[PDB]
Amino acid sequence: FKSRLQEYAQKYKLPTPVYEIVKEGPSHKSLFQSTVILDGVRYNSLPGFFNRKAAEQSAAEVALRELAKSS
């Protein structure tokens, strides 16, 4: 959520988005999942990521897309 979406939440007077990170699977074949929670609304990233940054970006994309939908 950090960046544009963060500034948006601030302008929307919404509670600071909560970032949670979930890591599962083998130590050599691990998968990352990012969850961004904003005002009770949960934004889950896509599965099948092998990088924390990749999952985080996906989570942000979901939040942004859902924002455009609500826009």
- Left (φ > 0), alpha (ψ -120 to 50) or beta: where does 61 sit? alpha
Alpha-helical segments (H) within 1-71: 4-11, 52-70
Assess contact for 32 and 50: CB atoms under 8 A: yes
Q: How many CB atoms lie within 10 A of CB 9?
A: 19
What are phi and psi for residue 9, nearest 5 degrees? -55, -40
Give me the sign of the Cα torsion angle 20, 25, 28, 29.
negative
Domains along the chain with CATH numbers: 1-71 (3.30.160.20)
The Cα–Cα gap between 63 and 7 comes to 13
What are phi and psi for residue 44, nearest 5 degrees? -95, 135
How far from each other are the two terminal CA atoms of the chain, in whole angstroms? 17
Q: How far is CA 1 from CA 23, 27, 47, 51, in A?
A: 19, 27, 18, 17
